[PDB]
Amino acid sequence: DHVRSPNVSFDDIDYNNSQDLHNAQESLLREQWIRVSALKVCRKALESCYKTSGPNHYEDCREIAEKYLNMLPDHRIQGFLGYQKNDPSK
Amino acid sequence: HHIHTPSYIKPPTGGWNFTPANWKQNTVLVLVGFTACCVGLYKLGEAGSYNPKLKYKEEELSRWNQSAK
Amino acid sequence: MLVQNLIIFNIIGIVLLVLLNNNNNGILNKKSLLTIKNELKLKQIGLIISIINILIIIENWIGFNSNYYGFQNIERFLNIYWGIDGISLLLVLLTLILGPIAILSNWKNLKGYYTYYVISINMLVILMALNFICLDLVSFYILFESTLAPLFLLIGIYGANNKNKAAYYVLIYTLASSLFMLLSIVIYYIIINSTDYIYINNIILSINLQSLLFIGIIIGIAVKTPLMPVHTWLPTVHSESPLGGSILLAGVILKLAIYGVIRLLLPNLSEISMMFTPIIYIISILTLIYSSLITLKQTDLKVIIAYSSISHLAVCMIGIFANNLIGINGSLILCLAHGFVSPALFILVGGILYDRYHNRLINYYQGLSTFMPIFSIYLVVFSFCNTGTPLSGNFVGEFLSITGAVIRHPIIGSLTAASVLLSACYQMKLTNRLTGSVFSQYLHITNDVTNREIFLLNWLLIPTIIIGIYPSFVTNILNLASSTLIYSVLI
Amino acid sequence: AFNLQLEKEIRSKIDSLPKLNNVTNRKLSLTDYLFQNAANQALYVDNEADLKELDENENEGWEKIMYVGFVPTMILIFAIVLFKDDKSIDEWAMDELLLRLKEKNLSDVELIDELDKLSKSHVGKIGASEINKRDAVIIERILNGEYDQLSGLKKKEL
Amino acid sequence: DHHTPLGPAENIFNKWNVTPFVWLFATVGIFQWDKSHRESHDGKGILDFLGEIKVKESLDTYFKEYQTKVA
Amino acid sequence: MILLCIFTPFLGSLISGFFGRYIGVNSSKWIVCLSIFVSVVSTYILFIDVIFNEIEYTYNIMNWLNVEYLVVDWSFTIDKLSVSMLVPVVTVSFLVHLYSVSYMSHDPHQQRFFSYLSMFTFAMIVLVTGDNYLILFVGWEFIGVASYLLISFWFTRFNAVKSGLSALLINRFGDALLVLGLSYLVLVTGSVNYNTVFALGSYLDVNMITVILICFLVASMAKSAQLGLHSWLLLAMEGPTPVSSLLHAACLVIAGVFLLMRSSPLLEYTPIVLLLILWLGGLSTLISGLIAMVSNDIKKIIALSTMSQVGIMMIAIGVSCYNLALFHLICHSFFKALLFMSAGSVIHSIISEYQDIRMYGGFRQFIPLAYTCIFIASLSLMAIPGLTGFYSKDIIIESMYGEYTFSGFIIYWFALISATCTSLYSIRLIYYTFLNNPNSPKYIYINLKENDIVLITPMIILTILSIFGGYLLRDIYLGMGSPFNELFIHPNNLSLIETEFSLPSILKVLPLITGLGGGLILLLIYEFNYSLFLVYNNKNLSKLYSFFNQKIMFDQLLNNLILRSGLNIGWLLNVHIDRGILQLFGPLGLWKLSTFISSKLNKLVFLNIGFILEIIVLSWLLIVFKVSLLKYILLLIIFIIL
């Protein structure tokens, strides 16, 4: 039916086991589309708030717009090759 | 008047003052079709249209910011 | 069993068309039923087979999952692994559809040897289709150069006056360049001991060895898709090649290079792609600007469209090398959109006008809307589609590619917007001239568009509009697959 | 309908008026194109050719193939894209966010009440659209905080 | 007077005008057929019979079998 | 009632386009007029609900783009600003359609003219009803496609086929920048929806805001025929008069101003763009009013009149008084549409069908109805108090001095010159065609009559709206404190109070005093003292006349120096690159090198024992030499090839 995301961080696996490495790539992707969807819902509130408030949209939608701009830069598909082929700890 | 060779040139619009012999017969045949289409647009239009300022009341929005604050 | 069915069926079909025709050579004069009506009973078999190949992919389409990550329908045939993912599904689907239209385009404008022509078209279509469903660099190369053998002979046998000049150009430009890709494919086979996609996607190479591999592969790509300054072969080939060859060449073959970027560069040379991306933009944007100014000062009818295809293939490369889903998805949609509008233009220019008046000089023709109104209607519509009109599929590809470039590089990527203005100049100047002023005094009044020629245009126009109005038929499939190519670390 | 005796009638008419340029009952079958003897195959060429030599681009042989083979194929492509029960990845994510919202707020009755009223065709349409539905609580919960474990998939910092 | 005569009588329901509407009418009915068929079969569309999307569990086996051979 | 207002013209446009052959000519014109009439009624119903009862409509059809965060839907919202654009467009277009039934009665192609004419109306309706910037772009492009067909309608006329291409290409230059601006909207904000984007105006950086709106401004310059991109405006007269009666009143011309008005939430927080908008208007108003006074064509003068009157809407935007510009846009759609139709009836009435105003004279008694429509329109165009022009045009000029800035003061004189020039060339046009001694052959006058009732009905309807409409609709837009949040005016930019209170009495009458005095002074000189206006005597006055008559030479500078130069760059690439170095470094160059080398080699293959003996002995030197000297032998071996 609705198959879930097999949460597997790259740091737990050895890339030699190809079946595991596939899981860590798929899991990182499926957690990135959820963030984009949560961006759409957040922006779906900003549109409704802006219209209903009218002239008040600078105060009745202040936090919603502020959160949307804060989350915009990093709520987009980034891919797994960025974190698979890099180790941030070094 | 003159000859414009409309014998073989048969565009979708006729061209060079073209009017078919049975133009009255097809005239209502389109009014019947066109009027039905507009009725479809009025039935589709009213069913699906909405007011974007009334879908969400003011109380619901006044709490959304408190969640995202 | 897709590939196993696909190769075996065509191999069976090729033998069937070989047996029926070449049985009557013998010592006897060719009094035969099969060749009656210009080999009508041997053309129809060839047209049926190209339609059937479309039914083979559809059988495997209904099982395709749009949500599972990785290659699907993984099969081992001829000791080669064949797989289909989101990107390979639409390019195979597009390739097979252009099969029947390539055959049907040359249905009654050949002087002879229709059996040879039919088999050559099918072999080009199948080999192109098989090229998107391989799973190693070596097998990618084999189906990337096997097309030269039928393509070199098709142009020479069924060409225009300068076919000798063009037959060399297609054979040598695509071999003296793709060989530089063989070196880079071989280097992978030496240091990794396998060319399989999934095996080499996970291996990082030194900073220098990625550059040496990128150059060797970009050389074989910058030639296959005409990119300045090695673009000087396609306009000659398009002018001389037959209508079936021109449809397949700019419809599928030039899109192999866009797909070649997806398989050979982005995943396994991911770091060096970011280093080369500013270089690609300078090369691509100047290709867009020059190939649209050059088109202004052209004279030949089919050459004019040839340079038009180059500009809309520079937009694809700009979009695909963007490091975001917006650029990558639009680049792929534009390839699909350009897979129908570009073949359609060659039918109007080199398949209807040339097949009646037998000339390709833009000076003769003007005011064709006076006695060829149906030809003008499809001339104007396919002209506005080719320029990036919003209701067409070109716009969706051209908007997302331009927007995708701006996200990657907002400064130089802004120049990608020149495609919006430049594509309007050279294109409408052709459409304005061909449908303007009094009917030309050099052309006698002849038959208007026939049923066969109308059919091709209607079935090359509808997919373009459908993608333009509602591209979610295409975007939804690609969204998972296109998200894998992106390389970025955000902290 | 090969009718060899009728076939010689056509060639006879050619011989009746040998000069040139100064059919309704004609057909064949698939089995005729293969096993007919050279005597018959030789003659049918003559009758067919000089009938043409007497003289608007119709009956070219492609009509019964493209309209029967190719056109239904494109309809099938049209049918598949529109009516395939496939979740796109973005659509799958939209469903998943609600499911992860349902589990993490089992103490929130109003969210659970509204989720059950969100039909299969109302899942990804959360917004001020034509559809008449109550989803204000759903939007509020999503604005409250994140509902993903992405930071749990990256175990290393700078 | 201009005295321009009328042209030949035309059939507005000719072969080239009816077909576009037939494609339009066919799609709407099939769309409405599919709209109902989902509720009466729990969200499964009219193409339920021709096949179904393959599951992830089945496909991962082919990938694992194929990734062992390549290694 | 929303979906009926938008797509009805599209249905009417298609009926004549494809079924037109089967439904004749006369029965095909009235069906197209029928489809527009439905839309006119539906707009007023919406206008009643939207402006007065504050109800908004939105019909979301289906999604269009779903690429990650970027979502764009085929939706069409109808809010207050949208309806205030539907009133000029849909109402005039019906009158243009009603006018065109009897104007184009003699044209052999009538089933095709009304197919594009209504398609134009639908293309504009989509523009002013899209609820995201991309749907606006779908409409924005299709004004050009519809205009390209209509301007080049008579495709057998060379000056008209070329004129369509000029109108299509210059707009694409504007559309090239609009696409770039749309991209920066997706980059900075992530969406192109009006709701999402406008809600962020106060939180986005100025430079990012400036970059987008500069692109919108360049896009608008092409459509509103402002300075630097106004060559296409006058070249568009090659189309039929109804085309000019529709494009230059409530259509393609005005579409630049609407885009800038829609972007008021973004435009406010960038003072630098509002300065550029203000200065384009002042120059375009000043220049057009000067060119119009020495032009000698009835349609060129009116065409130049629109460019001056559109520029007045630009300066009203530059002072953040968006309400004034929108109101003057609605008014101008009626006393400028009426001018074209009446002028299109003067040309039709005369049997020689001249268009030069120097072949007219003494027509007032012969065609008094067409004169009366022009005279009422001309006074309204001159902003005479009491008429629609006064309630809209004067207040914009009032506020040029009402901002009390240096830039505001300079543009005030440019407006004031154009306010007077509007009063000067308007009198010139009427005097040259209605109060002058006859120039045409006497045979024309004994056949110079009026037209039928169908051609007369629209002009009377527009004539009434050119008197009363400005007064009735003033308080909706220009009222004090009227709620019009669809157009954002920042609190620091509300200078409407100072404009209506701090202007001395002299300014409130100055445009009229110079307009009435200047017109009468010119009227006497034209009548009793015409010897002065033969400009061939004073070489300074001959050079001046020949300068503005050629439209500031901008047509000559654009054609001879940019298009001619631009085409030459394409020739240089074709010669020195495409057929040049890339052919020397290609098949032609490599044929020479191969022929050179293969010529040297074929000499070596010749049966000789002594020849093959020396090379065998020569190769023994490879063993002797230290292998550090291989590169030198390689260099020498190449030398011997030569």
Ligand SMILES: CCCCCCCCCCCCCCCCCC(=O)OC[C@H](COP(=O)(O)OCCN)OC(=O)CCCCCCCCCCCCCCCCC
């Ligand atoms: C030139 C030759 C003629 C051939 C080409 C003619 C032009 C093509 C016209 C049709 C274009 C094909 C697109 C129609 C197919 C319907 C697309 C669709 O799937 O709609 C999706 C919509 C929302 O998606 P979802 O919630 O996921 O539900 C679908 C699940 N199966 O689900 C729905 O609710 C269905 C909504 C159907 C809406 C009716 C379709 C309206 C199409 C006309 C308006 C196009 C948009 C407006 C553009 C006009 C110019 C501004």
Ligand SMILES: CCCCCCCCCCCC(=O)OC[C@H](COP(=O)(O)OCC[N+](C)(C)C)OC(=O)CCCCCCCCCCC
């Ligand atoms: C929002 C998007 C809406 C799109 C739908 C618009 C419906 C209108 C279609 C009517 C077609 C028509 O009339 O073309 C057919 C007519 C026929 O000739 P005629 O002019 O009647 O004169 C007839 C006398 N001849 C024979 C001397 C011409 O013209 C032509 O062959 C003129 C050539 C240019 C046609 C350009 C068509 C562009 C279509 C739209 C491109 C996007």
Ligand SMILES: CCCCCCCCCCCC(=O)OC[C@H](COP(=O)(O)OCC[N+](C)(C)C)OC(=O)CCCCCCCCCCC
């Ligand atoms: C997809 C996998 C395909 C694999 C099988 C390929 C079979 C090839 C045909 C063999 C039979 C044959 O040579 O026959 C010749 C056939 C048919 O000639 P015809 O015009 O009917 O002869 C009629 C003669 N009259 C007129 C006198 C009666 O023409 C061909 O040469 C076309 C196909 C091959 C062209 C290019 C070959 C080079 C291939 C290089 C590596 C790909």
Ligand SMILES: CCCCCCCCCCCC(=O)OC[C@H](COP(=O)(O)OCC[N+](C)(C)C)OC(=O)CCCCCCCCCCC
């Ligand atoms: C009342 C409800 C509305 C009525 C209108 C419905 C009309 C349906 C079609 C009937 C007429 C017909 O099929 O014309 C099709 C025409 C005419 O060519 P033909 O048909 O081959 O005839 C000529 C051949 N002859 C001589 C053998 C008879 O082809 C075309 O070039 C169509 C060009 C398409 C232009 C628009 C493209 C879409 C872009 C915009 C997307 C939004």
Ligand SMILES: CCCCCCCCCCCC(=O)OC[C@H](COP(=O)(O)OCC[N+](C)(C)C)OC(=O)CCCCCCCCCCC
């Ligand atoms: C690194 C980037 C790689 C790009 C692709 C390679 C360059 C393109 C060359 C195509 C030439 C062609 O096609 O040869 C065609 C040409 C000439 O043409 P023709 O038919 O005689 O017409 C001309 C007729 N005249 C001259 C009588 C008027 O023949 C030759 O000169 C044959 C020798 C070709 C040498 C190929 C060397 C390749 C080296 C590549 C590595 C640097």
